[PDB]
Design an enzyme around this catalytic site. Structure first.
Site, PDB file in Angstrom:
ATOM      1  N   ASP B 356       0.859  -1.173   0.000  1.00 57.73           N
ATOM      2  CA  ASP B 356       0.000   0.000   0.000  1.00 57.73           C
ATOM      3  C   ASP B 356       0.900   1.229   0.000  1.00 57.73           C
ATOM      4  O   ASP B 356       1.889   1.266   0.726  1.00 57.73           O
ATOM      5  CB  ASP B 356      -0.902   0.001   1.239  1.00 57.73           C
ATOM      6  CG  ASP B 356      -1.760   1.257   1.338  1.00 57.73           C
ATOM      7  OD1 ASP B 356      -1.386   2.169   2.116  1.00 57.73           O
ATOM      8  OD2 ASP B 356      -2.802   1.333   0.634  1.00 57.73           O
ATOM      9  N   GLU B 392       1.195  -0.319  -5.157  1.00 52.50           N
ATOM     10  CA  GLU B 392       0.791   1.057  -5.420  1.00 52.50           C
ATOM     11  C   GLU B 392       2.002   1.944  -5.691  1.00 52.50           C
ATOM     12  O   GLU B 392       2.757   2.276  -4.776  1.00 52.50           O
ATOM     13  CB  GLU B 392      -0.016   1.613  -4.246  1.00 52.50           C
ATOM     14  CG  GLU B 392      -1.386   2.145  -4.631  1.00 52.50           C
ATOM     15  CD  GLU B 392      -2.301   2.323  -3.435  1.00 52.50           C
ATOM     16  OE1 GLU B 392      -3.436   2.808  -3.620  1.00 52.50           O
ATOM     17  OE2 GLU B 392      -1.882   1.978  -2.309  1.00 52.50           O
TER      18      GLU B 392
END
Lengths: 713, 711, 143, 137
Positions: B356, B392
């Site tokens: 993330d 990400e």
């Protein structure tokens, strides 16, 4: 189009060549992020000058080239050709005419045959390194060998459990060749080889001497510099490799087609079955390719701008912090990987127990400055495997701001050169501040206690492969390195030594006695100091290099170990055995924590006390004033020492007296009844010297070391 | 000291049951602590310690002690003594009980109370003050676990694993996936054990997905601001420990049951040949900025674990948008993360990780370096260099957009694909080259840095934003339910409700919707790159227009397994489409199409046509379009399997008409057979086979895949 | 020298699935491709016909279309290979065969002498002279 | 054919869970069949197939195919196509679902019904006729 012979894309990992038994073939992986094209070369036993086949590695995953060749097996001789831009002024030095060695080779078949054709640039040409020599280097460059990694470590599983503690260690620095070359004891074909070093005869020797670990000098496959070859010499030490995964071919008793890797493993296996640790000396800072003007064997040709530290504003030139021509670029991801891959290999694959890094500081060089918190060191500290082995450093390189003593990370022991010098000067006659000598003897807390380090961080030594031997340290006032052919220009000029009254061999018994008593003064000091003692292999045999304090290019009797012992040499050998035995029997000299210099656990005695000639505790001024006499008492029963079981450890109470003063002195013993136990005296000890009671005075001849044990108080 | 102890070892970090010595070894990093205290609790009483042990041995910057007699199951915690000088970043507070950073199990969650803060909450001088209340009874305890656990037959899938090219990622939430599954016993719903139940594994197998991407499973805490407003943290992107499985997804308690449940779950999945990728948060912590609680890191060594503002250090640098950012440039912090990854791999048998806000991990002070120590150690690690890595490719800081820049071994979530593909079917006309590049793996992004189509994780929908159903049912977000007055969540969703906001009865609107859902699916499973499917879309999951259901632990997010004919029929469409993808190497390539003839063949591996039927040219290639038409020549592909064999496939003609109007495309030479379409009505006889480059009318918003059967 | 020829020939065989098939060539176009998996030509260059197929000959010429083969590996993948033009001239006399469409590159032959430049690549269906008792394998590199 | 399959091996006969390949290998002998179809069912629905796979690979007189993703517990059956000439012994009837001769477990028994016969039960021409009812359920 292309390959009317069978191939497979293969995997980019692991790097190097790998026998994949289940697929009947070998996987070849090679890093180069600047190469435009790559060619794999396969040779045969019979013909190693020209390739029997050429395969163009077409698959590239990221910055790694790879291919799988069906049918190849272990033993396959191979090499690479790397195509790319040739712009020396920019650091781009590709030359596909030059055959290269696989950086991840696990075995290299033979050495280099010097010839102007292994350079990449025209040797005689006016524009030197800027030129492009188009001669094939193939027939003069050794070949990489695909090895078979399987080797059943019989037992060995076992010494992998609890190993030789850091506090109980005693390092023995040896050279694989010299250690057994002159040993007519062994068959004449394993002398000076790995197999020989681990022969039953030699293991018995090590066990009897009582050393815990052996520190082998460089064993990474190396090359004899052309300038040594062109002057009849050779590279004996080996601090100049071209590969970081292959055992040196010349120390193998069973050939170089893989015999070197097999011989080595058995050797380590043998040592471990005798409970002996193995530390290998490693060079990761520089390469045998030297600066520009050097040969183009491996790295330079594969990816020069990635592997070496190039001068920022030029890149044609090489940054040199090693003093050997070039410095490895430890800030490049793949270069960092290579070194880490190397260490892990030697540990999990060759079962090595630790490493002693040559010019360690140069590994923390990030461009012109030194950072002890560089990517390399950080990855090292966190690696699951490498964070479990012993790490020792030369805490310096030769560059500006390279002296990094004490600054090295937590896992690291450092060679304590300060100890070597001070202790060397003390027994020479020089008067150093009492505090200076005392600090060294007590583990050098002033150096390592600041950064939360322990006495273990200090590798104390009075002599090593660098400089004089112990015998020569007391037989020469200056170096004699003519034999190297550099007009005595090489080697340290300051050795802090003294020939006891005569340069070289003598018959003057009065000079031989001085000498024998000094050798003992150094040994007693070493094996009675806080910290880890390192012994230079050969000193117990009274090894001599005839005053040569830089025998790096001497592959002969100057360095070979001489096992022919007369009564003098033999008698000193016995002194070293009993001294090492004394060290190992007393926890008071193998501490994990420094003495505080105060009373502990409600006891009425200081763990350590320093006295002066007349007998009173050292005070403020007398502590910082020069001296040639040191006297301290270690209270073995008031030590803050805890074993792994939470138990507090105890030991005898020792009174150590080190009189470096050339003159005699009358020291007044501290309270109690003391019993003599060790001394540098060669003559027979007098009755009034064996036991000193009621703080009387005892006369001590100059240059004498004594250890007394309190037997009543 | 009048109880038995041993110095213990500094390694490994955390608590370790040493069976052969009948005791536990405790190890904890803090280079700034002046003193450390170990706390042991009992099952019955977890408010106050049953004993306090002062860790006196310290090797380097690591404190440690061995306690004889302790066994697995032992509840424990720490108290760390040190300087309290907020203005300097030194925030020690021994009144606050801390969680072991290397805990493998945490018993319960936090009970919010002004006493778990370290500073006086109401006080005027805020984070500069020094609250002396004991936080012990409100902070969960660390649990000493027993690492043992026998993986049956699981050592097998450790050989050759699910290739990168044949992958299909399924993003699910451990809770929502089975909570509303009245099929399983009512005590394993929404748990690890449930996700790997026989019923669920059969479902995954039937759907045909290769790997599952579990959302965050690192033990986390519900932010106080959610608690104080009746909500909870559903997603879990806010942990306090990087080694313990979340206690709330455990069906067997939290005294170690969570670690056991998790292992069995992974073991079960592997016995069905399913990969497991876990979503991980290493960039920020649940402790937030200053003003936040003092649970673990802040109290153990604040200046070491967090990125502090250089000139102040009282404040926290925030590139995550969550209050703080982890200091990935500190040796021990780097070790912790790497120790975490290796743990989840070798110990929990995870197959990969999806990071993330990955970019925030490359932050070295104010700038971004993709060649930072962390990434370098990662790339060289023997174990971690063998697993899948997804990122990400951005954070929320300045210069945080790092698409394409990530190291070699990563793939990246291709947001550019998501957006473009989203806008194309919306009606928007993008440059033919833009759409084409996305469909062909985005070579313009990754082909430059020697990357392959695999680096591209293509997705049209994910846990972030709308669901697939909602993407075609709302023109804008409806996040009132979160209680932030609809201030949270993306404002631009590049969506269209097909003619009506929310649920409708207007069949003409429902048809538009059903045809669009199929247009997205066909595009996704026909694109070069790796497709990721948002778990629930096959079920037509709806979050009622909420495009940020991160605090919604209810029916808004729970998976609804009650399928009507419409939903059920779309579920079957997804199965057959996924089946189509998996059967044709032409859509699972390891290398990009070159756009030319190969191997002496008379056909281009890929050709792009225009409405009337001629190869796309210079201008028409860069001019906006609502229609894309290309032909993949499966027999002229530069595709090689691991055995050196060249792979072949059928020749496909793909027609994507995003234009709202009908269009008459003139088919290229050959005889084509229809095989896939978004049409809901029954296909007409003259549509099944098109021969002799005739023209065929195509209704607006229609996707079609034809296979050449003669030429 | 003949030992080396056998090694490279065996290596060629092992590198091309087109000569190690599990199923027979059908003699027709497959998978919607515009080429026959195998085609037999005659001296002047036209596909063998009814009579010429059953009439005696000392010359055989065929083209294997490696990209249109019904070959499946144990993993369900369709296997592909290069396109080869094989010319076997057993005729004791020389012959001038007219190459089929495309650009062909010479790869194997029984010639002992050194191959001439105009023999390495044949383009635009030109004619090439072939000495009697000669075997040649060409690979299409453009069409 | 727009779903994953593998040629599979003709041996051993019957269905076999091949753990290392995550799938099942199906093998069935018939030297007279013109075509063969594999039927996969689910626990919930055992009347009609959830999928139909045409076994296209045939090694000798044995038909076979490998289906990725199937595991132990999979309910299945066959349909065999061929000549229907009772007067010659050729009695193929793809309407009739068949049991694998090498099945290691059969789920349940037969539910008697005129539809499991291959010929029209009441018909005057008995075993010479050709009943086209599905026998599956």
């Amino acid at each position: 189009r292309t390959r009317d012979r069978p191939l497979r894309p293969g995997d980019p990992y692991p790097l190097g060549s790998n026998w994949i038994e289940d697929d009947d073939g070998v996987n070849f992986s090679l890093f180069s992020e600047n190469a435009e094209k790559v060619e794999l070369l396969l040779y045969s036993l019979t013909n190693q000058k020209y390739p029997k086949e050429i395969i163009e590695v077409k698959n590239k995953t990221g910055d790694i080239w790879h291919v799988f060749v069906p049918g190849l097996r272990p033993g396959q001789l191979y090499a690479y050709r790397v195509y790319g831009p040739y712009k020396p002024e920019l650091g781009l030095r590709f030359n596909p005419n030059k055959v290269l060695i696989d950086p991840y080779a696990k075995a290299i078949n033979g050495s280099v045959i010097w010839n102007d054709a292994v350079f990449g640039y025209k040797i005689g040409d006016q524009n030197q390194d800027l030129t492009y020599d188009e001669r094939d280097s193939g027939e003069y460059v050794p070949k990489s060998v695909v090895i078979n990694p399987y080797f059943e470590w019989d037992d060995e599983d076992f010494i992998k459990g609890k190993k030789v503690p850091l506090k109980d260690t005693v390092i023995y620095e040896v050279h694989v060749k010299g250690f057994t070359k002159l040993r007519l004891d062994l068959p004449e074909n394993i002398r000076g080889t790995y197999e020989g070093l681990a022969s039953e005869q030699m293991i018995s020797y090590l066990k009897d001497l009582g050393i815990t670990t052996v520190e082998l000098m460089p064993v990474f496959h190396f090359i004899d510099q052309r300038f040594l070859t062109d002057k009849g010499l050779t590279n004996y030490w080996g601090y100049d490799p071209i590969n970081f995964f292959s055992p040196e071919c010349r120390y193998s008793s069973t050939g170089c087609l893989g015999g070197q890797v097999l011989s080595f493993k058995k050797m380590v296996n043998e040592l471990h079955n005798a409970g002996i640790e193995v530390i290998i000396d490693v060079v990761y800072n520089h390469t045998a390719e030297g600066n520009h003007l050097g040969p183009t064997l491996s790295f330079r040709g594969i990816d020069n701008t990635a592997y070496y530290m190039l001068q920022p504003d030029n890149k044609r030139y090489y940054l040199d912090f090693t003093g050997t021509g070039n410095t490895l670029n430890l800030s490049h991801p793949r270069v960092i990987q290579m070194v880490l891959d190397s260490l892990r290999y030697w540990v999990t694959e060759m079962h090595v127990d630790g490493f002693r890094f040559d010019l360690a500081a140069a590994l923390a060089r990030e461009l012109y400055s030194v950072n002890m918190l560089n990517t390399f060191f950080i990855a090292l500290q966190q690696d699951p495997i490498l964070s479990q082995v012993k790490l020792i450093a030369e805490p310096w390189d030769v560059g500006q701001g390279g002296y990094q003593v004490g600054n090295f990370p937590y896992q690291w022991a450092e060679w304590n050169g300060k100890y070597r010098d001070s202790i060397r000067r003390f027994w020479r006659g020089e008067a150093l501040p009492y505090s200076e000598i005392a600090n060294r003897l007590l583990g050098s807390p002033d150096i390592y206690l600041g950064n939360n380090k322990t006495p273990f961080a200090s590798i104390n030594y009075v002599t090593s492969h660098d400089g004089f031997t112990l015998e020569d340290l007391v037989s020469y006032n200056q170096k004699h390195n003519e034999a190297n052919g550099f007009n005595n220009q090489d080697g340290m000029n300051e050795n802090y030594s003294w020939n006891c009254g005569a340069e070289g061999p003598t018959n003057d018994q009065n000079v031989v006695i001085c000498r024998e008593k000094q050798k003992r003064n150094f040994m007693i000091t070493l094996l009675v100091s806080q910290g880890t003692p390192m012994i230079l292999g050969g000193d117990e045999l009274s090894r001599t290099q005839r005053g040569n304090n830089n025998a790096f290019c001497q592959d002969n009797e100057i360095t070979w170990f001489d096992w022919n012992l007369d009564e003098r040499k033999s008698k000193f050998l016995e002194f070293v055995k009993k001294m090492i035995q004394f060290y190992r029997a007393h926890p008071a000299f193998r501490r994990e924590r420094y003495f505080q210099g105060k009373k502990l656990f409600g006891m009425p005695l200081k763990d350590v006390t320093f006295y002066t000639l007349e007998g009173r505790e050292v005070d403020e001024k007398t502590w910082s004033s020069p001296t040639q006499l040191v006297i301290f008492v270690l209270e073995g029963s008031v030590m803050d020492e805890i074993n792994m079981y939470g138990e507090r450890i105890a030991d005898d109470s020792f009174l150590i007296i080190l009189n470096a003063n050339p003159n005699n002195v009358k020291v007044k013993f501290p309270k109690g009844k003391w019993e003599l136990v060790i001394s540098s005296y060669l003559r027979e000890i007098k009755p009034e010297e064996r036991i000193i009671e009621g703080e009387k005075e005892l006369e001590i001849e100059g240059r004498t070391a004594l250890v007394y044990r309190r037997i009543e108080l």
